[PDB]
């Protein structure tokens, strides 16, 4: 485009679309479970992923993933939503922070425990 065309028109400033509106941009959002179930994975893989529909304090209602082996999430349980999709699960764009509110840390977790919310096991 000629220098004059630029002067007239101009270059188009890009724009990014929040790949996940945990609303108010906030790093996290509290919310209450409404449904908790086991959904199958996408294309190549096969499993029985654990997820939950959540009522956010941000008005919205989104599905969330529950990381780790096993959980204690029922219906009216409060949880903290984290945000991060799952290239395997349709429409799951938020993770649940284990060990916050009614969200229990993974039982018997002994490795990467910062994630999974597991206190340092007091070796007896």
């Amino acid at each position: 485009p000629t220098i004059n065309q630029l002067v007239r028109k101009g270059r188009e400033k890009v724009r990014k679309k929040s790949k996940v509106p945990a609303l108010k941009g906030a790093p996290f959002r509290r919310g209450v479970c409404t449904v908790v179930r086991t959904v199958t994975p996408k294309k190549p893989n096969s499993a029985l992923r654990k997820v939950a529909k959540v009522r956010l304090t941000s008005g919205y209602e989104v599905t969330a993933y529950i990381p780790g082996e096993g959980h204690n999430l029922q219906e009216h349980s409060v949880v903290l939503i984290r945000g991060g999709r799952v290239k395997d699960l349709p429409g799951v764009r938020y993770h649940i922070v284990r060990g916050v509110y009614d969200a229990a840390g993974v039982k018997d977790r002994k490795k990467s425990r910062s994630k999974y919310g597991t206190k340092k096991p007091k070796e007896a």
């Binding site: 199958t40 096969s46 499993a47 029985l48």
Partner: protein
């Protein structure tokens, strides 16, 4: 959803139960994963066509497989070993 086998199925199943327990438990494992909610589940559901058509297929251990039929309660196991 009552379970129903048949000739080639019970015999197919007995051989599994009396030749290898690794696949016996794996087989009935899905049967419970289905018996409740068919189609969707484990293994790797996938509607079949032609020879089977009305029959469904659950990927098991690659080569092996299990074919069935769903009908408002009452499942129907048809096969346990062999591809398709």
């Amino acid at each position: 959803m009552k379970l129903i086998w048949s000739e080639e199925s019970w015999d197919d199943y007995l051989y599994w139960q009396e030749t290898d327990k690794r696949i016996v438990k794996k087989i009935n494992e899905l049967i419970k994963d289905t018996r409740r909610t068919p189609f969707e589940g484990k293994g790797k559901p996938e509607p079949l066509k032609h020879n089977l058509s009305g029959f469904w297929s659950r990927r098991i251990t690659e080569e092996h497989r299990l074919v069935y039929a769903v009908t408002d309660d009452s499942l129907l196991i048809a096969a346990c070993r062999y591809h398709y």
